[PDB]
Amino acid sequence: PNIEMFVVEGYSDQQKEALVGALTQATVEAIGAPIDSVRVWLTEVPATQFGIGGKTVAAIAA
Amino acid sequence: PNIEMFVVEGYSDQQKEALVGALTQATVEAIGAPIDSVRVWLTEVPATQFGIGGKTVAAIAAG
Amino acid sequence: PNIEMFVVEGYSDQQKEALVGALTQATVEAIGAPIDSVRVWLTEVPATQFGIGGKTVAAIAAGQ
Amino acid sequence: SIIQVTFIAGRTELQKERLIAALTDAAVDTVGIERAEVRVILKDIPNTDYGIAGQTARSLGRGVDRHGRAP
Amino acid sequence: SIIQVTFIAGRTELQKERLIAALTDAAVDTVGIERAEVRVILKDIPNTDYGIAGQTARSLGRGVDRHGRAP
Amino acid sequence: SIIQVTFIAGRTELQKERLIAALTDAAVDTVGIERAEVRVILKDIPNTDYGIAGQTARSLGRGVDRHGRAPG
DSSP, X not given: OEEEXXXXXXXXXXXXXXXXXXXXXXXXHHHXXXXXXXXXXXXXXXXXXXXXXXXXXXXXXX | OEEXXXXXXXXXXXXXXXXHHHHHHHHHHHHOOOXXXXXXXXXXXXXXXXXXXXXXXXXXXXX | OEEEEEEETTOOHHHHHHHHHHHHHXXXXXXXXXGGGOEEEEEEEOGGGEXXXXXXXXXHHTTO | OEEEEEEESOOOHHXXXXXXXXXXXXXXXXXXXXXXXXXXXXXXXXXXXEEETTEETGXXXXXXXXXXXXX | OEEEEEEXXXXXXXXXXXXXXXXXXXHHHHHOOOGGGOEEEEEEEOTTSEEETTEETGGGTOSOOTTSOOO | OEEEEEEETTOOHHHHXXXXXXXXXXXXXXXXXXXXXXXXXXXXXXXXXXXXXXXXXTTTTOXXXXXXXXXX
């Protein structure tokens, strides 16, 4: 299993570490994959580059 | 054809340049696609963001 | 430019054709890219494989 | 935020439903993302279409093909 | 419903806003996806990182680098 | 270490296996990645779903659809 999660910028490195761990364990538990076969990576998106309903997250937050 | 390779950060531009051409050539040389149709890009993942067996590459490299 | 759109299964071929063209034209106009440089494709997802809020689109549909 | 999963074909509908719930729970619990914002996409890759160490999964006896048939 | 854009670094923030707005409009106007469901993600690829026909974008005098300005 | 390929549907099992091998070789030979850890994901797009200059590959008479059938 390969898991790519797109996250908007702003999470700490320790939140990212917990996320990759929790995503990995969720996969192990849900589909019984062996933990060492699971690849999880995060792709960080600047808020100027993440659109919801046609508006950027930056514009929404402003 | 579109080729996306996820790499952990660390490679140099020159390593990258040679990776791109090799992936393009490998594609042209495997299936016979016109070279002009082959797009390759590298997505570099910071080591704080890419996990193997549940641990980040950064954390593994703490000792 | 490369535009990938994930869509739930269910759109007709005519709709997909229309969507591919409109995403291409949107890209040409918004950033001025020549149309022949713009690659657009749809990745179709069965409704049992697309989750919103932890529920599949199939379960959401079946709940009216 | 948006979670894209690729994995060898062969999982059942219930395993896919479970994985979508568990990945969503993991994002909500770990970083507090609003549940309604979490999207999950699962893409089944036929064993003819996934390479491990230069070999296809079907050549290693793993997975099923596009019609759900084992090797 | 989820739109991922990959394209060479160098576009302005205004171009990125325009592209997010126009791709969303295309989804809404063409197949009737509700606006609030549409997500657009833009990925900037440095020119040292993106190949045209085997050569990098920088080799061909296009885009910018991971630092933000290039030939 | 993870290679994702998107291309119009229509290629054969043997073409795919050649591609998987070739791309894996190219990665190991150019930057010395462990061969055992290179993953190659091939993503077939039905010709109804793939756009060339705004037109579907099927309209251009290329590839196959989701049922594996040529545009003829």
